[PDB]
Design a protein around this ligand. Sequence first.
Ligand SMILES: CCCCCCCCCCCCCCCCCC(=O)OC[C@H](COP(=O)([O-])OCC[N+](C)(C)C)OC(=O)CCCCCCCCCCCCCCCCC
Ligand SMILES: NC(=O)C1=CN([C@@H]2O[C@H](COP(=O)(O)OP(=O)(O)OC[C@H]3O[C@@H](n4cnc5c(N)ncnc54)[C@H](OP(=O)(O)O)[C@@H]3O)[C@@H](O)[C@H]2O)C=CC1
Ligand code: SF4
Ligand code: SF4
Ligand code: SF4
Ligand SMILES: [Zn+2]
Lengths: 91, 169, 89, 182, 115, 205, 312, 90, 136, 186
Amino acid sequence: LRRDVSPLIQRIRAFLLGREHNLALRFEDGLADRTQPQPEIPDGPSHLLSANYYCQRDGRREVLPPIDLVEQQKQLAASKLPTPGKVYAWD
Amino acid sequence: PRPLKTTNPAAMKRGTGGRSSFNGIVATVFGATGFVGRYVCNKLGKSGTQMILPYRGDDSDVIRLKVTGDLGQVLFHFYNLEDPASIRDAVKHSNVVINLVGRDFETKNFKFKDVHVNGAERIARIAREAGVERLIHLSSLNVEANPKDLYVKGGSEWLKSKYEGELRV
Amino acid sequence: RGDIEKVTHTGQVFDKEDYRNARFVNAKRYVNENWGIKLIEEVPPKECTERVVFCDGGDGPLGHPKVYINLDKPGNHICGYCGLRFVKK
Amino acid sequence: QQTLPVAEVAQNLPKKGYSPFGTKQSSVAEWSLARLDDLLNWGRKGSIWPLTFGLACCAVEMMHIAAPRYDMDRYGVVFRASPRQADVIIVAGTLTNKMAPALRKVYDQMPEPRWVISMGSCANGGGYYHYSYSVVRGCDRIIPVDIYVPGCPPTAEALMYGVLQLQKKVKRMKTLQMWYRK
Amino acid sequence: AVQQVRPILSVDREEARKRALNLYKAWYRQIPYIVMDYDIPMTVEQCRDKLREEFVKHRNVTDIRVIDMLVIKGQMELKESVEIWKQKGHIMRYWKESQDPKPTDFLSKFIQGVN
Amino acid sequence: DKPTVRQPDAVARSHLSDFGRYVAECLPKYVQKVQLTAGDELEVLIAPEGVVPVLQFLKDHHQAQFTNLVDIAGVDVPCRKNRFEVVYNLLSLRYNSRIRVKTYTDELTPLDSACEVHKAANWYEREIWDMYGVFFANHPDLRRILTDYGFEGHPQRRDFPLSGYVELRYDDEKKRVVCEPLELAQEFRKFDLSAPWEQFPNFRN
Amino acid sequence: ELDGETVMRADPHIGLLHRGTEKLIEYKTYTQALPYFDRLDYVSMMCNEQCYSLAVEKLLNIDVPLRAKYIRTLFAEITRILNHIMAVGTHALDVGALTPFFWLFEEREKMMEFYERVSGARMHAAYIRPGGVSLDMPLGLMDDIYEFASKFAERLDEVEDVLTTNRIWVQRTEDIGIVTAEEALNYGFSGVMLRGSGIKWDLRKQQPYDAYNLVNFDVPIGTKGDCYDRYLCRVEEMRQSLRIIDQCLNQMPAGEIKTDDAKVAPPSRSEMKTSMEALIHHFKLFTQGYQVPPGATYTAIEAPKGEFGVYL
Amino acid sequence: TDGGPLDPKTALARPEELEQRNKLSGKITVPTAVNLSPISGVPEEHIRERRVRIHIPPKNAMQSGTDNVNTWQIEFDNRERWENPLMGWA
Amino acid sequence: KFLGINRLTKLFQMVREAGGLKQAYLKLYRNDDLKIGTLVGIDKYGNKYFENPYYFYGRNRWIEFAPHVNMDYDGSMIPAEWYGWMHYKTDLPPIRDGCRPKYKWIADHSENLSGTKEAYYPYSTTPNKVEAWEPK
Amino acid sequence: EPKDIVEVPKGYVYVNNKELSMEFADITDRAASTMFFGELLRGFAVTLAHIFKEPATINYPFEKGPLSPRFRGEHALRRYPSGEERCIACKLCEAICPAQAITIEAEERADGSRRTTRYDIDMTKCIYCGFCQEACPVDAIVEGPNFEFSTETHEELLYNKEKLLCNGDKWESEIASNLQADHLYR
Ligand SMILES: CCCCCCCCCCCCCCCCCC(=O)OC[C@H](COP(=O)([O-])OCC[N+](C)(C)C)OC(=O)CCCCCCCCCCCCCCCCC
Ligand SMILES: NC(=O)C1=CN([C@@H]2O[C@H](COP(=O)(O)OP(=O)(O)OC[C@H]3O[C@@H](n4cnc5c(N)ncnc54)[C@H](OP(=O)(O)O)[C@@H]3O)[C@@H](O)[C@H]2O)C=CC1
Ligand code: SF4
Ligand code: SF4
Ligand code: SF4
Ligand SMILES: [Zn+2]
């Protein structure tokens, strides 16, 4: 079915490998067909025609200029020390 | 006073002095394999001259001359001095023909008359019949009618051959 | 050789006095023998009944984008993408 | 432009033969020099030795003719480190401003006969970095090129097409017959 | 007008002039080792004349930060010439040995090309 | 919900807000403005004279152990009075975060080198020397790193053209690779892709 | 600078392959600037496309679907195997072992065949884009990738049987090039050179991106910091990449391949031929491209050589 | 100050070295009109020959939008373009 | 006989199927491997396409070139219809591939003509756009 | 079993972490593998086993490697089934060509149709990326299956409009099959 050596040389190769040998070389029986039926890619979450508007889906307009943190604290104000994040132990 | 033959906007001089531009000269460089021919090809390719380089031998001898010119400015041709049809194909679209063809020793196929006199006559006659404006054939400094031999018997055949070639051109 | 003096479908040919025909002494000139104009006027016009018709290249998704041509004006109406001609009697 | 002939016309034509210079040349000395040139070009198109150069990504493809799918050693092609022990330099990758005298020195120290394969779009004409300041516009303007492998990464099929076309160029290369007709 | 900036290796003009003269001395010492090693077709006297011309075309500047930036760049070329760090193709770039000279009269510029 | 819109991290926003106010409280002299951009990244705009201590503070404080300096990026903005800006990107492994420290530099004004703090900058500022041309004082080795040895000018400066000023070829009467003025065989076709209608109304203020 | 055979001063000179990439990126559209990143790093490519795509998607504030996330994760670990096979073969040629170069480049050529199957190019795929992937995977890629991942464990077992246990490889790798961890942190190391020196730091686990937090794997940590620990760390990243490939072949959902912002992602050919606004969005996405909002970002991923960052 | 170990490269340095470090840490007075032509690396021919036009770019007359008008820009004078004799590019 | 004597029998079957010892020698000289397989197709230009699924993937389908050429075979002799079948793009040979079109303007296949007098050389396709005076 | 120097955390793997055993059996085992070349003989055994394997080489050019219908090769200009060339000179492909290889010049044709008069592709500036294939609205420019088009001369790698039309005429069947088997992926 598949091109290989006779099983005496196969047993010699399996003894010299130290393990049972699976064929590295690919064959036509192990692979899929080259001609496949024509697929249909399904629609995503917003190809519905009724409910969606772009104003609720526009990620490019929901960004803002960066927030001055001292000015933000000054506007909104008129224990452990602050860390940049959760403590991770890489030791 | 001095008429301009081409009168085509693609054929006139354009651009600056670099290699990618065109200087309006379409030069055919005979004997470009040799010692003077490399420097002549480089000085032509510095100014953006479209060059037709005819070679008589192998392609590996003239593959080094693609460096001097840009893309489209170097065109190789195969010729022989016993065949005027290849020279007619070479100089049919040339304004300048440069003759650097020469040999310092006798060859079993080409004698001194066959390379300095008769081959120069074939090149010059084909270039005159093809409408080439200029021809810049070289010579030797001490060319004479009867150059007397100084040391060897049979010497100064080269100088006499270059002299007879230059008056016949 | 006749390919040097042959004219392409864009109306281009090099002159006999031009230096640019010296590039074709060692490599032949490529002129496409299938001009698009002759093969688009060889196709007969399509007779239609409706006032407007749609064109999509004849292949569906593999043609051009679908456009609608009006046929109330007398004459042959040419699709601007594929060059097919429609007519209404 | 000509096409490949129809099988009836192909059956009408005879076999081409191995020799590109023809069978007979109507002279004993011309036939002897043509057969000596055939033996020499067989010895030269067999086992061209490329150079371990590898400027860029196109080089990774160069190991895919080393890799056992394509096996460049089947054709005689085998890499050598020194430029003196090499026929071919495969200029494959981006040739920059700092590598102009490097490539010129490595090409010049390589001995005649010299054939250069230009693999990849950067080595052919600059490619995706053509309009930059540092990249030399192709490797033609420094060193001569005999074979232009066109793919940006070429398939190793397409690189061995360039290698086989170089072997066919060496097979058509004639020096002794040129010496007889010079 | 007036501006308060951080200096580069010198406060006044005299130190920048001393650094430029130190560049000239170091380049003078480095020229005979450049000539014998780099395989260039330039005589030692031609190299010193080119060094003089390179200093002459930068005599016109007056600002001390511009002068010290020129000193830093000249020290970089000196360090790229003490260690070899370069080829013969880049040493000859100062002479511009491949560029054919262009005429300056208006008639020859009119005849040759619009540049 | 909104599957197209990217969902941010609220706890990372709160942690970087508290740490940015902590940094602005700790160094009132050198820290000029602390901002928190979209995408949960903190930018600490600083004075030039505070280029070396603040990073040292960010190397050595107990709530600021930014041990890795991953890269230094230079941005050339020619419209400003101080032209170049220099962006230090630092990664903290202990608190698992990143910070950006941005400063401004003229074409002649120095920057104090961060090689005493982070040794990776030992080449990184060299790249900023080669691409832009800002002098880094107290540098152990300041040389051009990426360009040619005989190269003149600084490439990624916006006053420099895209294709450079010169080209290289091989010349046989000098037997050398030589330098020629730049002539393209085909010029770089510049495309006008400027937006004629504005799209973002939040960035005009 | 050498006193004998031993080095005194090793100074690297670079810029020999400097192509002016960033100045050139400044002149192109983001879609045109995407094939640059295939040519930044040569032997891992879909990782660099992933990093640039996460940079543009963080600037655009859009989100990729789950299927595109799993495709990006699966091809990122396939790309990791390719980089490690490149690293193992390069280190074997530099040390002197000629054989595992070819023995692993057969499998590496199988993965570039997989790349050609999914994208159409063997190496520079241009596949991972801002807003998902360009194309869906073709039918039957599952069986091919599964057969390859079934055999690759035995191929690595044979390569490790030749290379790992040998005394010459140990004497050529162990106690050589030892880097301390404080030097690794001070000199800005990233990736395996951090992981070989005992530092527990993997960017796929600490700051996860593109569905790495729905898959489970192990982070290999070296002990000594020499060449042998980094080689064993690369082989363990190879095996854990096989594990992540197994999990991604085990679970993937059915759905879209790209985001549905038609002003960001290009539309398909059916709504090209039928609809009108999709033709407008195609024309303005392939003439001038999308409008990225103004601002700065730095997105860093775990490439197999280390942290790969883009400051856009 | 602190009673820890002092910095050895400042205590052991000569008085000329302490004066050299303090003078570079200060601020010098310079003119604000600075010519940076030899520093920028431009060839001198483009310095003496090219003319620079500062302009607001023209609005496209077929389009009502004025967002691309909203900046000023520097552009350089148009030199000679030509057709290459091989294939016909600019 | 458990050592491969049946493979020697298959080699002798290969020799008898090749057309004789001299024909097997000629086939082994031209094609560097000697193999057996079912004949799938014969392209107009005279090449033969064989496919045997017994071999390694990549050696399943192969081409024996036209007998009128020798030592001039290359990868450009394969026509457009058999190109996807030889490169494993489709599993359908063009004998039963009814989807492949055949128009009047489709030219026949050509090989690579570089290094030959009939090569390609580019030119400007647009004509002259600036007309001169023409005083007469 | 050898002991562990550092206790591993959950989800991490430590390599070179096992302490060498100091008992007599393991020392004798590593001593016998030292003086009798145990791992060298194991590597020689693995290598001698892989001598007996089947090669993965393919007989180029008689045998060619596997490919895909999406494969990017030589650019080609398709035509309609009626015979008219598909390209309508919209310059989307050149606007998206990221190395600016394509050069398009156009005018109105004599029948009034919008057509090209110059379609140049610098094949030495191309990167074979398929952006012109995706950008093309009428599916005119495609990447053909051809990749054996290595030339001896740099000028032959600068395609004219006529060379691309000849490539579209020559490679029409395989390009039509690929766009039949690939169009719903795009
Ligand atoms: C059909 C044939 C198949 C096999 C063919 C191939 C044959 C095997 C390989 C041949 C040589 C291959 C190339 C050279 C490889 C060299 C490897 C090498 O030496 O590496 C260095 C390594 C180094 O050892 P290491 O790797 O343990 O290093 C750590 C130790 N230090 C650093 C201190 C050295 O190995 C050796 O040197 C091992 C010893 C080799 C010499 C053998 C000594 C035997 C002593 C006598 C034994 C007595 C037993 C008890 C008797 C009791 C009596 C009462
Ligand atoms: N010192 C000098 O060199 C001097 C030279 N001259 C003259 O200058 C000219 C060029 O000199 P130079 O370069 O040194 O000489 P070379 O010998 O170096 O070059 C001569 C050239 O002519 C070609 N050639 C030689 N014989 C023939 C032939 N029979 N048919 C066709 N072509 C042939 C050669 O081709 P290929 O190499 O392929 O065989 C080569 O390209 C000659 O006319 C010479 O007489 C005058 C005075 C001094
Ligand atoms: S031609 Fe393409 S693959 Fe080759 S070096 Fe250039 S970008 Fe890389
Ligand atoms: S494949 Fe890409 S690089 Fe090549 S012509 Fe098309 S768009 Fe340009
Ligand atoms: S995108 Fe297509 S139709 Fe438009 S100019 Fe290009 S090839 Fe022609
Ligand atoms: Zn239509």
